[PDB]
Amino acid sequence: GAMKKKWYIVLTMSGYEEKVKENIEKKVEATGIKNLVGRIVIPIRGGQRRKSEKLFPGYVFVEMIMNDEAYNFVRSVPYVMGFVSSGGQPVPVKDREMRPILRLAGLEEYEEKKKPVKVELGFKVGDMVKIISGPFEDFAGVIKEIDPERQELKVNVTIFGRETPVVLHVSEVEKIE
């Protein structure tokens, strides 16, 4: 419903995301349409300690009110290739799926981190590892690479129907078995 605002994924060209975000800010300024567009988020932003460098290339997260004037205004966005969707307009993202984007996007700050325990043994590449610490806490992933000497394990998380490797601390994830 237009009254309620949801978050959709805007399609773009890797490298033009920052431009798309700014284009939207002014696109609504010259049109004074600050009611169709709301807050824009980007999976690229990461913790200051480490930058994911664009978690999803060409993929951007934006919240806006659905409507005929909103679709025609967003679709007309410069540098925008369209929006991810099954039929027409794009579909809203499940809040549970944004949890990791809002937390990393700085949209939500929570604690839940009093379980500083390092996990080791039964750890191997390809093995299945579950996340339990960080912005993706509670996320299941597969061990893609193990970096010894530092206790770090690269895991591939399945987000947006796509697989993507994430850098985390071995003590921040669990290898189930």
Please identify which residue in the block is written with the tokens 């191997």.
124
Indicate which CATH number applies to the domain containing 98. 3.30.70.940
Whole-angstrom distance, CA of residue 52 vs CA of residue 135: 12
Q: Are residues 51 and 120 in the same domain?
A: no
Q: 41, 59 in Cβ contact below 8 A?
A: no
From residue 174, alpha-carbon distances to 5, 28, 47, 128 in Å are 36, 45, 21, 9
If one counts every other C-beta atom within 10 angstroms of the C-beta of residue 38, the result is 14
In the chain, the amino acid numbered 173 is V
Counting the structural domains of the chain, the total is 2
Whole-angstrom distance, CA of residue 52 vs CA of residue 105: 11
Q: Which of 52, 78, 110 is the last residue of a domain?
A: 110
Q: Are residues 77 and 1 in the same domain?
A: yes
Q: Are residues 98 and 123 in the same domain?
A: no
Structural domain harbouring 102: 1-110
Q: Which residues of 54-78 are buried (b: 16+ CB within 10 A; e: fewer)?
A: bbbebbbbbbbbbeeebbebbeebe
Q: Are residues 53 and 35 in the same domain?
A: yes
Tokens of 154: 């690269």
Method: NMR
Q: Are residues 106 and 152 in the same domain?
A: no
Q: 104, 85 in Cβ contact below 8 A?
A: no
